[PDB]
């Protein structure tokens, strides 16, 4: 736990411009090692009143060490700014795959699938659920291996947006969603308003494109039902028949 500052670093490449701040390559200038820092606005996240969602999140972050969690080694601020020293990931997010090749093979999916699903038992042994497990925060590592990063419905089960309450089953929720986006391109509650989507959440209706094979559309049935209880443990997402057919992660 060195405590660091800007001047500890080169930065480089834009590799993401969002409406909050933006992530750059950098190196470290002592070492060399290159990785990521990402840049936040301190006025921006007081106004947004999420300091202390900021404080947790980057509390639990440095302590979780699996390969498919996106590794945070650790964070500073100056007068304006809070920055977040970042593994850095190589081939980009899962989302930007997506629109590239706009729909994933059953093997890239049901691998995908494998790593997350591994990195997420991990996460709830160590009491961790999370919210936006989503493209655009799923990273890829030099070999390829999905990295889950971490900080609008599309992604989240009944029983949160209908304000029940909710344990370690929203992530396998969102295995379904992300499951289904992965094989047809898009999520599967998707509309052109929120109101909407939240009709197509909290009533769950989803269809299948034709192409979508019998084992998958099992396995996302599986994951999106309404009651929790009975989506399946993450364990039984491993040895779906599908999954170990297809995946290439055991
Ligand atoms: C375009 O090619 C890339 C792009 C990123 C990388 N590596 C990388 N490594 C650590 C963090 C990030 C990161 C973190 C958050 C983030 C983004 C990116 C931008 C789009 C998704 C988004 O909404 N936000 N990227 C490598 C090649």
Not at 61 to 67: A, I, V
Not at 114 to 139: F, G, M, Q, W
Not at 191 to 205: D, F, G, H, L
Request: hydrophobic share 35%; glycine share 6%.
């Amino acid at each position: 736990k060195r405590q660091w500052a800007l001047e500890d670093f080169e930065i480089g490449r834009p590799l993401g411009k969002g409406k909050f701040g933006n992530v750059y390559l950098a190196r470290e200038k002592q070492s060399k090692f290159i990785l990521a820092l990402k840049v936040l606005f301190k006025a921006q996240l007081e106004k947004a009143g999420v300091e202390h969602q900021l404080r947790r999140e980057v509390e639990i972050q440095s302590h979780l060490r699996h390969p498919n969690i996106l590794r945070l080694y650790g964070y500073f601020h100056d007068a304006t700014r809070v920055y977040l020293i970042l593994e850095y990931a190589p081939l980009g997010t899962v989302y930007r795959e997506l629109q590239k090749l706009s729909k994933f093979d059953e093997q890239r999916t049901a691998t995908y699938i494998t790593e997350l699903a591994n990195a997420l038992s991990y996460c709830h042994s160590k009491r961790v659920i999370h919210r936006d497990i989503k493209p655009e925060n799923l990273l890829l590592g030099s070999a390829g291996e999905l990295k889950i990063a971490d900080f609008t419905l599309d992604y989240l089960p009944p029983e949160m947006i209908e304000g029940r309450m909710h344990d370690e089953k929203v992530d396998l929720w969102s295995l379904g969603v992300l499951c289904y986006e992965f094989l047809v391109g898009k999520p599967p509650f998707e509309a052109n308003t929120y109101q909407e989507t939240y009709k197509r959440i909290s009533r769950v209706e989803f269809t299948f494109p034709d192409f979508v094979t019998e084992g998958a559309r099992d396995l996302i049935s599986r994951l999106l039902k309404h009651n929790p209880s009975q989506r399946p443990m993450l364990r039984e997402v491993l040895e779906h028949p599908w999954i170990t057919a297809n995946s290439s992660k055991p």
